[PDB]
């Protein structure tokens, strides 16, 4: 016969790139947008803005 | 006889400069935080 050597994703290396988190009710709440902005830095230039 | 150890008195000046920044909010926006309230139908907007 032959076995099926399973592989875990968290035990891989690629997992560093993404943060995985389970969201149970998403498919229900996915009917609308979530729409969060993030940031943008800005220097303090001289002269009045 | 002309060596006569020398002396000097140099002077400098300051230089003015400014460093500004910008910031803005809306008027009614700021009003919502003043009122202390424990709902009152305004949490999300608050």
Method of determination is cryo-EM
User: Given CA atoms B32, B34, B39, B43 in this order, what sign does their dihedral have?
Assistant: positive
Answer yes or no: do A49 and B17 touch at CB < 8 A: no
Nearest alpha carbon to residue B17 among A44, A41, A32: A44
Does B17 contact A at CB distance below 8 Å? yes
Residue A19: phi, psi to the nearest 5?
Answer: -95, 115
Which chain A positions have a beta carbon within 8 Å of B17's beta carbon?
A: 46
**Resolution of the model in angstroms:** 4.4
B8: helix, strand or coil:
coil
């Amino acid at each position: 016969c032959s076995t099926l050597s399973l592989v875990r994703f968290l035990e891989l290396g690629l997992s560093v790139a993404c943060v995985c988190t389970k969201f149970p009710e998403l498919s229900y709440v996915a009917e609308g947008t979530i729409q969060f902005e993030v940031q943008q830095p800005m220097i303090a230039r001289d002269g009045p803005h | 006889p002309a060596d006569q150890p020398v002396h000097n008195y140099m002077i400098k000046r300051l230089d003015r400069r400014s460093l500004n920044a910008a910031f803005s909010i809306a008027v009614e926006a700021l009003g919502l935080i003043s009122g202390e309230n424990l709902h009152i139908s305004s949490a999300m907007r608050l």
